[PDB]
Structure formats: C-alpha cells, structure tokens
Write an enzyme that holds these catalytic residues in place. Sequence first.
Site, short mmCIF file in Angstrom:
data_model
loop_
_atom_site.label_atom_id
_atom_site.label_comp_id
_atom_site.label_asym_id
_atom_site.label_seq_id
_atom_site.Cartn_x
_atom_site.Cartn_y
_atom_site.Cartn_z
CB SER A 119 -8.42 -9.21 1.98
OG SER A 119 -8.27 -8.29 0.93
CD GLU A 234 -2.17 -4.36 1.95
OE1 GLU A 234 -2.74 -5.05 2.82
OE2 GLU A 234 -2.18 -4.64 0.72
CG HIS A 263 -3.30 -7.95 0.78
ND1 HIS A 263 -3.95 -6.93 1.37
CD2 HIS A 263 -4.29 -8.82 0.29
CE1 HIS A 263 -5.28 -7.12 1.27
NE2 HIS A 263 -5.49 -8.27 0.61
NA NA Z 1 1.80 -0.07 1.52
#
Ligand code: NA
Length: 285
Positions: A119, A234, A263
């Site tokens: 990230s 995600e 994520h």
């Molecule tokens: Na997505």
Amino acid sequence: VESGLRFYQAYDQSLSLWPIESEAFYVSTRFGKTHIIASGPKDAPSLILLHGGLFSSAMWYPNIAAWSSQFRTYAVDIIGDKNKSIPSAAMETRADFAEWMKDVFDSLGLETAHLAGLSLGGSHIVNFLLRAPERVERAVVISPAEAFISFHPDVYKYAAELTGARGAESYIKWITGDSYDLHPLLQRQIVAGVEWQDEQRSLKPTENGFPYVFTDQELKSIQVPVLLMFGEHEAMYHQQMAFERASVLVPGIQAEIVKNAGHLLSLEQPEYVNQRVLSFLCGGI
Ligand code: NA
Ligand code: NA
C-alpha cells in the site's frame, strides 16, 4: 498523550506475534528518529520492509520468518504515520520521501537493498526506485496506494473519517472485505492508532506528495526488477486497469493478480506471498 500511551501499548501487544528474535532501535534522518525492527542473519543481503498506512511494522508478523531466513530484514516505520517513528520536519513531497529513505539506508550503513512494501510503503518503493535506482537491488510492490491507477472516489470518504474509533472500524471493515478478519491484536492497534490525535503522525494528502499516480513517462523509465501484486478483491481501485497499465509500461515487470485476496494481500495469503517474494528476490543473476 493518554491516547498515545494506549497506542504504544497496543503496538507492543501486536509485537508478541513476531515469530523470531529481533532488534528494535531508531535511526537518524532529517525527518526524525525512524523506528526499525531488524531480524535475520547479520551477513545476509539487506531487505527493507515498508508497511501499509496505519498498520506499522507489526503487520509483517506472518511474513517475517520466511524472509528473515535468507535476508537481513529491516522493517521500517514510515515517519508521519501512526507508529513509533518520531517526526521532526514534516515529510511532504515525493522528493522528501526519497531523501528520508536515503537517510535510513545511510544510518543503517547500506549501499543497496531489496525492498518490499504494501500500500503506502508500496508507493514509497515505486517512488524510491525511480528517484534512487542506484540504491535498489530488487523491488516488491504489493497492493500499492494508487501509483499505477487512481483511487475510487470512495477512498477519500474512508480516509476523511479516520478521526476516531468508529471511522477506523469502518475503514477496517471495508479494506479487509467480507472474507478476512485481522488478528484481534492488529485490529486493536489500528483502532487505537486512529484514536490517538497526533497531527504529525496523521497521514494526509500533500501538494507534490501522495496519493500519486505515476505518469507513463515515469513508469517507462523504471530500470530495476519489480514484482507487482494485487488482490482480486482490491477495494481501493480497479486492480485490472492498474495491472494492465503496469504490465504495458514497466520494462521487465512481473505483475499478477492473486485469487481470494483483497487489499491486505500479505496478511490474507501469507503462504503464497512469502514464497513468491522469496522466489523473486533470489531471482537475480
Ligand atoms: Na477492485
Ligand atoms: Na472483514
């Protein structure tokens, strides 16, 4: 303050999950004392780890044993986020970010290193390998904060509500997805991080900083081996478009989208991510 103590306490709790011995210490940088957790054989090649926003270095617990067999790992707390690094001058522009990391490298006595990040730390790594390619061996970018494509408009609502516990839980529920729960210790730490009202350690958008989408021009100029990983679920952007764009623009990139993950890919699929990164990092000739 009082909240600060509760956060530091929660962080220390989270660190009971660290599966191996390690050394915690600070290094000097022109943006403040930066916290490092170091593990692995002292004569092994260097690997810098950069956590996602709000998570701190604690989030590497399910990856650290695998990576610290073959590497001297340095888990770096991003200064200006909720963690143990202590901001002096505010780190503001993308030039600042790379200067901060050069100081970390310098204070650690490192000429070059592998880097792996999630990230925000993933976006730091893309910025670093562009601005300081001479200091990078191989680079691993997991679920980057923008960098390859724009956030969903949603992302800013979730970010804007990180003002207390309710906001943090809402963020966590959204970012994890319906298939993954954080370990209770990490859940607690992140919530307590957000409860701690400290503006110097609050992530915020800045003029020539983050969030940022790298241009075709910048991406085509990358001259180091990159491994890019997204999760199929995600929540923050269209990972297909980010994947397609990165694959087209970045020379020699290994980019993929992993099934049954969102994520938080290093936390959700640690077995796969652990080995994939080891394979990539040891891929140099
Ligand atoms: Na997505
Ligand atoms: Na969840």
